[PDB]
Design a protein around this ligand. Sequence first.
Ligand SMILES: *[C@@H]1O[C@H](CO[C@@H]2O[C@@H](C)[C@@H](O)[C@@H](O)[C@@H]2O)[C@@H](O[C@@H]2O[C@H](CO)[C@@H](O)[C@H](O)[C@H]2NC(C)=O)[C@H](O)[C@H]1NC(C)=O
Ligand SMILES: *[C@@H]1O[C@H](CO[C@@H]2O[C@@H](C)[C@@H](O)[C@@H](O)[C@@H]2O)[C@@H](O)[C@H](O)[C@H]1NC(C)=O
Ligand SMILES: *[C@@H]1O[C@H](CO)[C@@H](O)[C@H](O)[C@H]1NC(C)=O
Ligand SMILES: *[C@@H]1O[C@H](CO)[C@@H](O)[C@H](O)[C@H]1NC(C)=O
Lengths: 367, 374
Amino acid sequence: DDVPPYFKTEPVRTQVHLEGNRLVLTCMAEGSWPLEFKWLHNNRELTRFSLEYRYMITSLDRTHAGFYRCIVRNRMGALLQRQTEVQVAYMGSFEEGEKRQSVNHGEAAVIRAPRISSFPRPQVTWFRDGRKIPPSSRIAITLENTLVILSTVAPDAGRYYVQAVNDKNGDNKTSQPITLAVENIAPTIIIPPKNTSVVAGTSEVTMECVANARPLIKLHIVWKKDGAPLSSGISDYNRRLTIANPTVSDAGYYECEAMLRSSSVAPVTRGAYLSVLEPPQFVREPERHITAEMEKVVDIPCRAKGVPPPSITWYKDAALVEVTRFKQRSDGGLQISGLLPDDTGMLQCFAHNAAGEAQTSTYLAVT
Amino acid sequence: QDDVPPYFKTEPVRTQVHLEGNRLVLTCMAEGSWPLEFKWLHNNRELTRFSLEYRYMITSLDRTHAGFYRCIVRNRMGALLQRQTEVQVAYMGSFEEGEKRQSVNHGEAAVIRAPRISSFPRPQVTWFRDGRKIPPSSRIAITLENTLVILSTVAPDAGRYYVQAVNDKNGDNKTSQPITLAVENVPIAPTIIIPPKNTSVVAGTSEVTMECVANARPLIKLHIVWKKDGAPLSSGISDYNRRLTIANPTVSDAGYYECEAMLRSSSVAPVTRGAYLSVLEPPQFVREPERHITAEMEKVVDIPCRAKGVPPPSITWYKDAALVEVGKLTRFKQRSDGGLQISGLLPDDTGMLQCFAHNAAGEAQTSTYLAVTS
Ligand SMILES: *[C@@H]1O[C@H](CO[C@@H]2O[C@@H](C)[C@@H](O)[C@@H](O)[C@@H]2O)[C@@H](O[C@@H]2O[C@H](CO)[C@@H](O)[C@H](O)[C@H]2NC(C)=O)[C@H](O)[C@H]1NC(C)=O
Ligand SMILES: *[C@@H]1O[C@H](CO[C@@H]2O[C@@H](C)[C@@H](O)[C@@H](O)[C@@H]2O)[C@@H](O)[C@H](O)[C@H]1NC(C)=O
Ligand SMILES: *[C@@H]1O[C@H](CO)[C@@H](O)[C@H](O)[C@H]1NC(C)=O
Ligand SMILES: *[C@@H]1O[C@H](CO)[C@@H](O)[C@H](O)[C@H]1NC(C)=O
């Protein structure tokens, strides 16, 4: 008939799956006959148009990971689906071989964990000569799984290796030993806070600061958000700052201040920005159906807000609009001047972020 | 180091959706001294006995496997309760009901609820009249509950109505038995057929939708205005102004949302119906106990635990993965703030103490090892 395509629902932005498990992607669109469907992987065609609204993978492997989206069409026009990221849980082997490292006695030893390919990042247990190494006042283990001995002693010498476990599929692999040799002061920050981005509602995000001082027992780490002292979410010998349920208000400059108690010496601070992200949301949208006369000018509205502020891209029947008779306003609205009857079809406005994308559509009829 | 108390390196996701027939691997990512053993629970019922296996694996998921899973980790020092995960299984049953008959007066509203079908998640539903798709329109509304509402019936509305229901997670596609509608010949003020319902959502869900289906004669002059706490809204409104969708809901987005149905250019008074939007945030700890607590025998120790969230979180204490008796005539008392007070410390009070703050939006936990000296 004459019902333009439209989506009944949108897919989740991200989805994690096990290797060997089945994946079923759906294009939940409605519209007039014949409603046909085309699938894309990383914006590259997987299928040709058909009445099949599903894309099914019987047994997932790593090569299947990526962004999927469908294109729905009929006689009226075509729409680009909001894309979903399919992530496949896997774990490779430990690549590196045995290695050697040397540190001076009483100084900090920084031993980075051997690289292993894995999604998600694996949980890592450190071993010294077959014995587990839990965190302590002089032993720090970073979010990057880096081992940091704050003040080395002779019996620190030995063979260090990691056990890495993938929490999603339960894969468990052990690396080759790293031999540490121990060879015969104001507060310093060894592992500074890194810039961290997170989407609102992620439930947890952690900043980290590993500090060192002589004497070590007098070392005290103070956490601040935009200069304001923090007193919650702090753990792991004051090296981790964790924000539960982060919101855009939880964004800002988080600094780690390393100081010595009962000491005159000045503290040292290192800081990083926490970016809490909100996916795009439309403020103004075009009407479902727009009618306009030939050779005339039509203004099609599209405003969106998000954190960071969303960029706006227009599509005509699942294809990119070149902005010519087409102009895009600063607000993001589309202006089509000198309307031709062949400008008839589905126009789509995509508001995209680092946190995700949103879409709104309309059917333009040129009389 | 045979005396390192158990602790979790990470926690499982609060909710996870899986397909029938797919394999599930649950992990208890805990560290600690030997022997580190693991026990698994389904809806707080034991699945296994303690063992060195940190994984629980289901080869082929079905509907019965859905529910809450959590592990208990232990060693010589004590035991910790894992934060539990909800495993949800995507499925779809058959349409239970058979053919049915319905009657409406001409020019009046027809409300046809969709035939019940067992499915997770809720299926997307397309309505058909005599083999023809029924898209929403000025007189045709389709609710979030998949109910079909004809605002002003006419003679050719009579016929057989059925639904096509598709499960967007596994792509299952089933069709119901027809519902026969009869239109019987036997100026209507603006009324609200489907009023806004009380709706709850967790912050960061990215979308939550209120709905209001209104009816009036004439329908052409009918206009729906959406307001939050009395202030008219101009964004997130769609589906002929029947849907109000809030993207990226925050605690600030909570309040009283009312649907106002009015007739443009008309003497008649408008009608207003409203509901509450509850935006929820899972519990977050304000004050926590330290990693290790040492205390002298026969003395009193105060172990702190304060948490904030919406709704206000209730607080529950555990001693070695078992519920702590805070009831009267015990040595264990819970402060109003949520802190635990242990008076007359006995050497068997040594072990892992855990504080669980739980909401409707989820739970949070913090632990400590209590060592009682002398
Ligand atoms: C971390 O990133 C900042 C910039 O991040 C953005 O700007 C902030 C003001 C805040 O709005 C964040 O949420 C944004 O994501 C880096 O800041 C730069 O610093 C260099 C010198 O250090 C300066 O020349 C640049 O102008 C700054 N801005 C940019 C955009 O580069 C900062 O260096 C990063 N690293 C840290 C803090 O360790
Ligand atoms: C809906 O719920 C009402 C009470 O809801 C609670 O109180 C308000 C003030 C909000 O804070 C809300 O988040 C709470 O859950 C009931 O009074 C009412 O009967 C319920 N039903 C309807 C149809 O309104
Ligand atoms: C992981 O595998 C190693 C074998 O290399 C084994 O010693 C260790 O116990 C395993 N981890 C477990 C079972 O948690
Ligand atoms: C769903 O099943 C019905 C019933 O056979 C069929 O008519 C329809 O085409 C199916 N939908 C598809 C294949 O997308």
